[PDB]
Amino acid sequence: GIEASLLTDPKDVSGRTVDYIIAGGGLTGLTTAARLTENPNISVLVIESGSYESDRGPIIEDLNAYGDIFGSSVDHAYETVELATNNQTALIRSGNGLGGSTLVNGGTWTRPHKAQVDSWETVFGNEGWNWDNVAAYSLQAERARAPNAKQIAAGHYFNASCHGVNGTVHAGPRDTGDDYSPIVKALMSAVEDRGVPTKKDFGCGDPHGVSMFPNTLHEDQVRSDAAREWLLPNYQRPNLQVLTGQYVGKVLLSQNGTTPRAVGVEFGTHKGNTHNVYAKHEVLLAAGSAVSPTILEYSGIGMKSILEPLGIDTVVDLPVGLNLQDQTTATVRSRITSAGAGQGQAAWFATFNETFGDYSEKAHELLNTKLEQWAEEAVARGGFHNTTALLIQYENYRDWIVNHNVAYSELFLDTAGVASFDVWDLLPFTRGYVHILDKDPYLHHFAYDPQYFLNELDLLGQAAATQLARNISNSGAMQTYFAGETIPGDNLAYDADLSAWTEYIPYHFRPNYHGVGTCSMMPKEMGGVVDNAARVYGVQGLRVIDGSIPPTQMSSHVMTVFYAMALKISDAILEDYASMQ
Ligand SMILES: *[C@@H]1O[C@H](CO)[C@@H](O[C@@H]2O[C@H](CO)[C@@H](O[C@@H]3O[C@H](CO)[C@@H](O)[C@H](O[C@H]4O[C@H](CO)[C@@H](O)[C@H](O)[C@@H]4O[C@H]4O[C@H](CO)[C@@H](O)[C@H](O)[C@@H]4O)[C@@H]3O)[C@H](O)[C@H]2NC(C)=O)[C@H](O)[C@H]1NC(C)=O
Ligand SMILES: Cc1cc2nc3c(=O)[nH]c(=O)nc-3n(C[C@H](O)[C@H](O)[C@H](O)COP(=O)(O)OP(=O)(O)OC[C@H]3O[C@@H](n4cnc5c(N)ncnc54)[C@H](O)[C@@H]3O)c2cc1C
Ligand SMILES: *[C@@H]1O[C@H](CO)[C@@H](O)[C@H](O)[C@H]1NC(C)=O
Ligand SMILES: *[C@@H]1O[C@H](CO)[C@@H](O)[C@H](O)[C@H]1NC(C)=O
Ligand SMILES: *[C@@H]1O[C@H](CO)[C@@H](O)[C@H](O)[C@H]1NC(C)=O
Ligand SMILES: [Cl-]
Known part of the structure; x- marks a missing residue:
């Protein structure tokens, strides 16, 4: 069985050499481990903390x-650190x-807007990283099932052209066995009354309007x-080893050559009892966006201003840990009538103007005139180091909004007994950071600061989107099923205006946990940490292959893109394997 195959004893790999070491057995780590070990000649060791x-x-x-x-x-x-927006830790x-x-x-299984991925190539200089290519990899990873009559009647629409059916990740409609709630279609009707589209397949490249989706x-x-x-x-592959219960602390570097080279990693659970394991080809970091950047810093790869005070020698100076981008989420929940009973989820991917409504003109005026001021302010807060480069990101977001009308907020509906919306501004302008606060990796002492709501448009957009969820929960066809709001409920007057919502939201939100960007894949000159093959600048044999690298957020749930990203980087790794014989 798989449980018996897992390694738990550090002595089982201490001092050994494998071709590739992958730090983190998560989404990108395991996808990459599977792809690399398809070649029986390639030995891979995945080290996972859990x-x-x-x-x-x-x-x-x-x-x-x-x-x-x-x-x-x-x-x-x-x-997180004590957040400035509300003086609380999240x-x-x-x-x-x-x-x-x-x-x-x-x-949730959905894809972003074509223009967003295309900009990774045209704005962030990543050759080959465009919608056509990333989507192809995403379909390759996918093994989707079309909806049946019951599921279609509930509100599902599936365009076969937009889904892989021969892949690896099983995806299809969630179906608990009971009737689907008529509230999903009621929400579709409510937004249709406002001219908003419905039933678009969110895996096709234009996620907009209200639809159901695969899971x-x-x-x-x-x-x-x-x-x-x-x-x-694939666990029976002899060349694939998985060590559990251990943390990769840092990357071992040789500086005896021209450029520093990653030769292995140190791992363990506490200072003083660590172990080394070596890689003949490369070390691949896949510990997640909150951690891969810290592994780099503990290794001497990061900003001197951060590393020096902690006693760490800066081997390669890069803006590691900056550009952190996570979203804010708030909830609107209401009681429903028994007529609304049943299962079902759906989501409204709402454009900027759908989100802001009659405040659209004023919100556009901010978007048009405050980008430089916002970039300077975010850099002063330590969310980024190069103002001009951050301004380029902001103009890219503006271009997405004004020239492509991409979804700006997501209003996610759960039913199953209530009508509950979790709502988030998909494209935050705030930029945060994560930095280690000690030299010892095993102390896990770090400052993770997403800087939620420290940009004024993010606060306005979140407030507008959450107010919209309350509005639509009692609009048009949704009125029938409405049996009273429970959240905010007594905590915020039902007729609250936009200003009131902006005062309420900082005290009633949670992180969305979609954090990206801490080892951004973009040119070094734009503040990047990795190139278009995910290789850390200035270091040989070292890559970051996880959610740390996307340089932007996207109007979607990220798994469809991260699986594709892992497969694409795996191919780049295999091309280099052939060049390193
Ligand atoms: C998170 O926490 C931090 C603290 O850790 C908060 O930051 C501090 O915020 C306070 C204000 O809440 C601020 O203190 C003021 O500093 C001013 C000098 O820069 C003072 O002039 C001011 O004094 C007035 O208000 C006091 C408090 O009521 C009175 O005791 C004092 O006598 C002064 O009173 C005058 O002004 C008030 C109106 O404010 C008026 O009613 C009176 O009639 C009179 O005219 C404060 O002491 C700190 O400087 C901030 N920073 C720090 C490091 O302490 C932060 O706001 C918190 N964030 C959130 C979201 O809650
Ligand atoms: C609550 C929540 C809800 C989400 N909902 C959705 C959704 O509905 N749809 C969607 O598409 N996406 C969703 N996501 C996001 C998606 O799951 C993540 O973006 C994705 O798993 C990130 O992949 P990754 O490879 O970067 O990191 P992860 O999958 O997080 O994997 C990193 C791995 O590294 C391990 N690790 C950490 N530190 C170390 C260390 N020092 N050494 C060794 N191993 C270490 C971790 O234990 C983990 O297994 C959600 C995420 C969260 C947290
Ligand atoms: C299905 O998707 C393909 C590819 O995006 C597109 O050409 C086709 O028009 C779509 N069909 C429908 C009915 O939307
Ligand atoms: C959004 O609203 C602004 C301001 O009224 C307008 O200029 C812009 O064209 C609108 N975009 C869409 C897609 O309706
Ligand atoms: C800052 O970013 C801009 C825009 O990407 C770039 O032109 C410039 O070279 C960067 N500055 C430095 C000092 O690298
Ligand atoms: Cl199946």
Whole structure:
């Protein structure tokens, strides 16, 4: 069985050499491990802090149990700094175990807007990283099931041209067995009355309007976590080894040559009892966006101003840990009538003007005139180091909004007994950072600061989007099922205006846990940490291959893109393997 195959004893790899070491057995780590070990000549060692959780039971396997796992050993629960917006510490839910956050996520499977991925090539200089190519890889990774009559009647629409059916990640409609709630179609009707589209397939490249979507689960409804999809079918490969229960602390570097070279990693759980393992080809960091950048800093790769005070010698100076981009989420929940009973989720990917409504003109005026001021302010807060380069990101977002009308906010609807919306501004302008606060990796002492709501448009956009969810919950066809609001409920007057919502939101939000950008894939001159093959600048044999690298957020759930990203980087790694013989 798979459990018996896992390594737990450090002595089983201490001092040994393998071709590739992957730090982190999460979404990108396991996808990459599977792709690389297809060649029997290539030995891979995945080092994961957690262990196998896929067969534990409903708390992991049933998507409807979402959230029950929070606070447990399968949740890293990274704590942020005391946030300036509300003087409180927030918790960043992040999966701890083989499969990473795919063990604890909502399972939502959607793709971003074509123009967003295209800009990774045209604005962020990543040759080959455009919608056509990334989408091709995403379809390659996908194994989707079309909806049946019951699911179609509920509101599903599936364009076969936009989905892979021969891939690895099992995806299809969530179906608990009971009737689907008529509230999903009621929401579609409510937005149709406003001229908003409905039933677009959110995997086709223009996510806009209200639609249902596939989920990452098998037909029997078992969660398609990355370990179940990429490791379980392949664990008997002799060349694939997985060490659990250990943290990679830092990358071992040789500076005896021209350019520093990653020769292995140090791992363990506490200072003073560590172990080294070596890589003949490369070290690949896939510990997640909150951690890969710290592994770099502990190794001497990061900003001298950060490393020197901690006693760490700066081997390669790069803006590691900056450009952190996570979203803010708030909730609107209402009681429903029994007529609205049934299962079902849907989401409104709302454009900038749909989000702001009659405040659209004023919001556009800010978007048009405040970009330089915002960039200077974010740099002064330490969210980024180069103002001009940040301004380019902001103008890219403006171009997405004004020239491509991409979705700006997401209003995610859960039913199953209530009408509940989790709402988030998809494109935050704030930029945060993560930096280590000690030289010892095993102390796990770091400052993770997303700087939520420190940009004024992010506060206005979140407030407008959440106000919209309240509005639509009692608009048009939705009025029928409305049986009273419970959240905010008594906590915010029902007729509250936009200003009132902006005062309420800082005290009633949670991180969205979609953090990206801490090792941004963009040119060094634009503040990047990795090139278009995910290679860390100035270091040989070292890559960052996880959610740390996307240089922008996107109007979608990220799994479809991260699986594609891992497969694309895997190909680049294999091309270099052939060049290093
Ligand atoms: C997060 O926490 C930090 C603190 O850790 C908060 O930052 C501090 O915020 C306070 C204000 O809340 C600020 O203190 C003021 O500093 C001013 C000097 O720069 C003072 O002039 C001011 O004094 C007035 O208000 C006091 C408090 O009521 C009175 O005791 C004092 O006598 C002064 O009173 C005059 O002004 C008030 C109107 O404010 C008026 O009613 C009176 O009639 C009179 O005219 C404060 O002491 C700190 O400087 C901030 N920073 C620090 C490091 O302490 C931050 O705001 C918090 N964030 C959130 C979101 O809550
Ligand atoms: C609560 C929540 C809900 C989400 N909902 C959705 C959704 O509905 N749809 C969607 O598409 N996406 C969703 N996501 C996001 C998606 O799951 C993540 O973006 C994705 O898993 C990130 O992949 P990754 O490879 O970068 O990191 P991860 O998958 O987080 O994997 C990193 C791995 O590194 C391990 N690790 C950490 N530190 C170390 C160390 N020092 N050494 C060794 N191993 C280490 C971790 O335990 C983990 O297994 C959600 C995420 C969260 C947290
Ligand atoms: C399905 O998707 C393909 C590719 O995007 C597109 O050409 C086609 O028009 C779509 N069909 C429908 C009915 O939307
Ligand atoms: C959004 O509103 C602004 C300001 O009224 C307008 O200029 C712009 O064209 C609108 N865009 C769309 C897609 O309606
Ligand atoms: C700052 O960013 C801009 C825009 O990408 C770039 O032209 C410039 O070279 C960067 N500055 C430095 C000092 O690298
Ligand atoms: Cl299946």
